[PDB]
Structures are given as structure tokens and as C-alpha cells.
Design a protein around this ligand. Structure first.
Ligand code: 4AM
Length: 512
């Protein structure tokens, strides 16, 4: 597709993907590139660095404060007060000033903007964080953390209990807990009253408490998370921790009876001799319809309609797509139609994998369900492609260099036969080194590099009281932490559907 045909398609990730393929082959001239960032759905990462090689944009500076950005540290005292106050939004700018100019500006702004006064006078010390913490300036605390992570200080009970009322708290808490940074911040957060936190923050404060072996504080935080979390899946994770810590059998009972299918509810069912949850059976009689499952533009179109449809229009779409050929779209519609209530675990293009052993089948299907929901022309924001969501680098390495497929193009990843085949090949590579399907999942999502480095650590997937569950909470990238949990449930389920059951307790033992 040329830049002309693309310009006449709707903005979407597919169209971005194709513009990016033109850019990477140097087929976009400086003239084609004029009208172009209005043809881009998500102007972020490599498509934007590539377009800026051709047309390097300088904007944006808001036209009303333009004059404020003509001053420097050496001339800021010549600027009007509006200009002074705008420039002082930057802690780097404040750090650049000399110390008597910070004193001067601190007085100027003491009545009207004490927040600026506090930062100005804090940067006149050798420890700005210490100064801000003594004022209990909460906005300033978060501005300093974002300026530099290296500041670390003990925080008293009054101060830590104010932090959660600021929007930055949740990312701050998660980030220092899972990265194991800022030990003094971490230790201080033991004294946060569970009444003051909720949802993920509460959860991560329970994980924090466990790392300091404060099991009673942890329980209290996990209990608060269970009460406040919106998603049943997250509640279950919290209820599991409550159970593991204090061993109340009503917690486990509640968890065994969850409507969410996840590793926590699966495990609780297995410990209480509860039957495996009901998996829906989608068996459309109709063979095909008009829809091209190989057209990435048709998928982008129909996805947006599906996601924006009322309860009425979902019924019309469910009927249209109730066919074997469009089975992944049918299931996608039924997941939205039933408000995420029933359990769909389809096995499309099954002929391409029925000859692998059943364990491999289940891992392939588990990965695919998480990666794409089996959509053949799925495209991620980093332009990973097809059912098994291969980055183009890897797809080209396997297809051209290893399998020297005649006339391989990366868009072959949109073919089910190719996706499953390449997925099997890549999963052999990963499983041969990592063994556990959980670790394979982590490596499939985040690379074997990061997986091998996490597994090399002294404190990860070793023996302990609360292992391997604690380690699964401390996987250092949020996306991978979540991916692995999801893929593991899927794997358990697909092993069951294929009459190759395994106990999830065995999976957990093999993690240590
Ligand atoms: C199969 C495959 O290409 N795996 C890759 C992974 C996936 O592309 C990702 O989970 C799909 O969204 O991303 C990344 C990544 O670092 O973004 C690396 C993995 N090698």
C-alpha cells in the first residue's frame, strides 16, 4: 500500500503500522511528510522518531507564555511575576538558579505561592527532600521524587498518611516496592493506616508489609484491597493473600466460589475439591461470511464498532459473526455481550496444532488467547503482529534467516498457520531454557534477557514461607507480572479442555 491509498483509510494502528513500514524503507519524502501527523492514530515511539528525522518539529510552547522562555537563570529577576512563576514549575530551572536568586524569589512568592518558596529554599540546602519533608509539603514531595528518585529519607506517621491523597502516590508506591528502591520510603510506608488507602495501593502496601515480615499489617492491607478493588480478579488475588497469611477457611471458600477464572480461584477450587469451572462451548454451524479475516483495516473498523455498540447492536453483530471462519470475532463479541461473565476458551485454526503434544497445544493457545484473543490481524502499539503477536525483528529473523521461507514478509504473521508455527518454534526456544510455563510466559512477553536476570536474583522464585506467590507479586515489570498470571490460568484451562489436566499445585511446586 502506497502513502496515497493509506491516506484514504481511517486512522488506526493498522494504518500507523503501514506508514511506519514506508518510513523504515525511506519511501516517505519530505513532501509526503507535510500533512502526515494528522494521519497518525497514535503519534508515539518509533513512528514519531522516524517522522521527526524528516520533519523535526520544535513546538509546542503555549503562545501566551512565549516571552517567559526567553529568560534564563541569569536574567529571571528581570522577568515579570507571571513569567517568574511559570519558569519555576521546573525543578531543573530551580536547581539552575544561584542561591541568592532563590532567596529573593522565595520572599517574592511566600504569601501567594508558598509551594514555590518551599522548593526554592529547599534547593538552597544540600538535601531538598529533607527540607520538603520537614514542611510536610506533599505536592513538593512528589515534584522532588519525579525530579530525582535518588532522594530517600524516613517519613514519620503523619507524613506517610498524607501521601495517598495525591494522584502520584499509586505509581510511587508500586514503583519503589517492586523495584526495591528507596528502602527508607519503603520502611516508612508500613505506618500507612489501611483506612487511608484502597485498591492497588492497598494491595502493594500489603506486599510491602510481607517483605518486612509484618504479616498482620499485610493482612490488613490485603483485606482493604479485597473490599475496595473493582475487578473480581483483583479481589481474588487479595483474598488469596488474606487466606495464605491468616488461614481463615471462609476466605478460601469465598475464593473457591468466585465468578472470575484466575490462578487464585482455580487454586482455591482445587484445594476444596470444587469442580473445574464451566467453559462455554462455541460451535457455529455456519462456515463463512463476507468478512476478510486477513484484512487488518477491516479488523480495525469492526473492532471500533464492537467496542462502541449498545446491547442491541451487539446482538446484530453476534449473529453476523457466528461462523467458524470468524470464530475469534464471535467470541470477542460474546465476551462484551455477556459483560465478561462467561468463560471463553476457543481453539481456532486447530488443524495447524493438532499434531503437537497436548501440553504444547495448551501453551500455544494460552499465549494466543492473552496476546490477541485469536484475532489474525491484531497489531499492538509497538506493531507486534497476528495471533501470537510477533515483533517484526523476531518474525524476520525466524522467517528469512532460520526457515528461509520463499518471499517471506513480516505480514505472514497475520496467517494463522504462520503465527502458530512461529509461536511453536519460539516456545521451543524458551521452554528448553526455562521449563516452567509461567517463566516461558514472562520471557515471551518481556524477553528471555529480563527473565534470566530476574531468575538469577537471590530473592526471586526461591524457597520461602509465601513462595512462589510472593515472587509473582515482585516481577519488576507490571505488564509481565500480569501477563504471566493470565497466561498460566489459560494454560491450566486449555490443558483441562484437551484432556491433559494438571494440578495447578504442581505448577506452583515447580516454580521454587
Ligand atoms: C513473540 C515475541 O515477539 N515476543 C516479544 C514480546 C511480544 O511481542 C509481546 O508480548 C506482544 O505484545 O515483546 C518483547 C518486548 O520486549 O517488547 C520482546 C519479546 N521477544
Amino acid at each position: 500500500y502506497s502513502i496515497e491509498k493509506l491516506k484514504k483509510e481511517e486512522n488506526s494502528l493498522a494504518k500507523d503500522y503501514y506508514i511506519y513500514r514506508l518510513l523504515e524503507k525511506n519511501k516517505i519524502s519530505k513532501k509526503d511528510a507535510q500533512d502526515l501527523n494528522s494521519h497518525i492514530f497514535r503519534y508515539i515511539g518509533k513512528i514519531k522518531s522516524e517522522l521527526e528525522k524528516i520533519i523535526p518539529l520544535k513546538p509546542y510552547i503555549n503562545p501566551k507564555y512565549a516571552k517567559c522562555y526567553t529568560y534564563t537563570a541569569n536574567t529571571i529577576l528581570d522577568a515579570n511575576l507571571t513569567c517568574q512563576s511559570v519558569r519555576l514549575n521546573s525543578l531543573v530551572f530551580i536547581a539552575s538558579l544561584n542561591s541568592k536568586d532563590r532567596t529573593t524569589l522565595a520572599q517574592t512568592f511566600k504569601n501567594q505561592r508558598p509551594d514555590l518558596t518551599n522548593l526554592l529554599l529547599a534547593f538552597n540546602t544540600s538535601d531538598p527532600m529533607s527540607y520538603i519533608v520537614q514542611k510536610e509539603d506533599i505536592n513538593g514531595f512528589f515534584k522532588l521524587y519525579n525530579y530525582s528518585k535518588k532522594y530517600d529519607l524516613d517519613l514519620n506517621t503523619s507524613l506517610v498518611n498524607k501521601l495517598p491523597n495525591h494522584i502520584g502516590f499509586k505509581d510511587f508506591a508500586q514503583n519503589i516496592i517492586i523495584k526495591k528502591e528507596n528502602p527508607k520510603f519503603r520502611h516508612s510506608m508500613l505506618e500507612i493506616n489501611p483506612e487511608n488507602v484502597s485498591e492497588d495501593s492497598a494491595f502493594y502496601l500489603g506486599v510491602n508489609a510481607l517483605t518486612y515480615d509484618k504479616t498482620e499489617l499485610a493482612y490488613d492491607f490485603f483485606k482493604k484491597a479485597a473490599q475496595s478493588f473493582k475487578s473480581q480478579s483483583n479481589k481474588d488475588n487479595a483474598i488469596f493473600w488474606m487466606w495464605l497469611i491468616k488461614n481463615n477457611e471462609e476466605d478460601l471458600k469465598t475464593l473457591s466460589q468466585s465468578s472470575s477464572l484466575n490462578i487464585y480461584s482455580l487454586y482455591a477450587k482445587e484445594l476444596t475439591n470444587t469442580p473445574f469451572p464451566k467453559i462455554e462451548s462455541l460451535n457455529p454451524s455456519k462456515k463463512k461470511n463476507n468478512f476478510n479475516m486477513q484484512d487488518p483495516f477491516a479488523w480495525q473498523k469492526i473492532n471500533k464498532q464492537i467496542r462502541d455498540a449498545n446491547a442491541s447492536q451487539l446482538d446484530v453483530l453476534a449473529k453476523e459473526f457466528d461462523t467458524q471462519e470468524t470464530l475469534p470475532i464471535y467470541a470477542y463479541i460474546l465476551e462484551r455481550k455477556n459483560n465478561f461473565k462467561k468463560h471463553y476458551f476457543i481453539m481456532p485454526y486447530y488443524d495447524n496444532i493438532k499434531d503437537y503434544n497436548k501440553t504444547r497445544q495448551a501453551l500455544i493457545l494460552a499465549i494466543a488467547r492473552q496476546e490477541s484473543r485469536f484475532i489474525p490481524t491484531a497489531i499492538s502499539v509497538s506493531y507486534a503482529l497476528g495471533m501470537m503477536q510477533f515483533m517484526p525483528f523476531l518474525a524476520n529473523h525466524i522467517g528469512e534467516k532460520e526457515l528461509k521461507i520463499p518471499n517471506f514478509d513480516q505480514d505472514f504473521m497475520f496467517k494463522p498457520e504462520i503465527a502458530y508455527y512461529f509461536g511453536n518454534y519460539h516456545l521451543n526456544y524458551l521452554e528448553s531454557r526455562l521449563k516452567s510455563p509461567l517463566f516461558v510466559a514472562y520471557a515471551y512477553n518481556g524477553g528471555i534477557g529480563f527473565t534470566n536476570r530476574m531468575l538469577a536474583r537471590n530473592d526471586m522464585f526461591k524457597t520461602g514461607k509465601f513462595e512462589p506467590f510472593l515472587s509473582m507479586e515482585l516481577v519488576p515489570y507490571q505488564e509481565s507480572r500480569i501477563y504471566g498470571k493470565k497466561v498460566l490460568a489459560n494454560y491450566i484451562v486449555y490443558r483441562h479442555l484437551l484432556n491433559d489436566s494438571i494440578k495447578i499445585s504442581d505448577i506452583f511446586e515447580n516454580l521454587i
